[PDB]
Design a protein around this ligand. Structure first.
Ligand SMILES: COc1cccc(OC)c1/C=C/c1cc(Br)c(N)c(Br)c1
Ligand SMILES: COc1cccc(OC)c1/C=C/c1cc(Br)c(N)c(Br)c1
Lengths: 115, 115, 114, 114
């Protein structure tokens, strides 16, 4: 129900080995760790959560772009890219969070489908 | 060897039923029709060409964004999005041309892999 | 030393009257208010800080995209757009943070000049 | 009535000295030269046309991205970036075409104002 896709706008490739941390806003308004992983050789990260676990809430998907660029050699502008959204508030949906990375820029989109 | 992926930044969905026309620059410097198709329900268009057919050259992938937006109801800025690139000049590669559409904007990227 | 520019990809216009909040990361890892404002008719927000106050550190620029879309009667995906970066003195002097907004997507870049 | 703004997503800067060629679609469906120039130090190109000359029609703005990247010693994907649009009098008066460049990608938007 939650997938992340990351592309590299410099290389024209998937962004591989990108760390991703997901948080969910708690009752007390803190950001609780929810899940985490790394993108694959295809720039994809699946298996973050289950439909049972992925309840309604406000989620933050933090993509560790700095760590990606620095592992490359390369000094980027942003600390990370954070994507924050309400999920599942009209029932369960499947979410793909995509990001396209450059050293001083990124774009992000969502694909939301109703299974 | 040539795939096209189109997303809709307004709806948060694949861009379905988008017409795509591919041209290849000829010896005489004209743009010859090469292939064409429509995106699927997943916003993807496969089956445009074969490795045999997809020789070295300068290719133009014209994504008919205006027709997409107008079929929607909706009056957009651009006539189309054109993606022009040299392909296969270091031997065969697989190319994915992606576009993310809004009424007054688009972004495009390439994913190039060596099979 | 710090400017924000916001554009609207649906209407082909500056994004006007967008709330923007800037925070600086404190020693205890919390985010403290730094500057805020609303974008102008040109989608710009100037006058956020001065050279004196804008010291090296980690800053967050939070753009209230949800309220922007809702005011236009459009349903959006994101709660906000967040741009988090380090200001570094050995780089050029002026930072412009730009964002290009759509309901389910945004783009952001930095223009850092001398 | 027509301005072009080009930014560099790798270096976080204006894209300076980029060649830009503007064409207008002729009655016979060919593209005829209209205006050209090179972006300034601020990544801008002004002075392309006048209100008198910039009549309704289909225009193409071709940004020579390949030469830009090659001059920086970087290998790029695209031959150029093409932006094709109709100018319509019943819309706002001034058109700004912006582009944000990376070696294997670009973004473009229009800001159309009165
Ligand atoms: C879900 O997204 C995908 C899934 C599979 C394959 C894909 O491309 C090969 C994509 C592309 C995503 C994408 C994201 C952003 Br942001 C921009 N700007 C662009 Br252009 C494209
Ligand atoms: C008219 O545009 C401008 C005028 C003055 C200053 C500007 O930034 C400092 C801009 C930004 C343009 C812009 C274009 C794209 Br395409 C994307 N993706 C992004 Br983000 C931003």
């Amino acid at each position: 129900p939650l997938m992340v896709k990351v592309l590299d706008a410099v290389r024209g490739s998937p962004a591989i080995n990108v760390a991703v941390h997901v948080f969910r806003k708690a009752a007390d308004d803190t950001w609780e760790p929810f899940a985490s992983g790394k993108t694959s050789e295809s720039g994809e990260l699946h298996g973050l959560t289950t439909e049972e676990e992925f309840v309604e809430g406000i989620y933050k998907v933090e993509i560790d772009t700095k760590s990606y660029w620095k592992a490359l050699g390369i000094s980027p502008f942003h600390e990370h890219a954070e994507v924050v959204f309400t999920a599942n508030d009209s029932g369960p949906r499947r979410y793909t969070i995509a990001a396209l990375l450059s050293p001083y820029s990124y774009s992000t989109t969502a694909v939301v489908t109703n299974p």
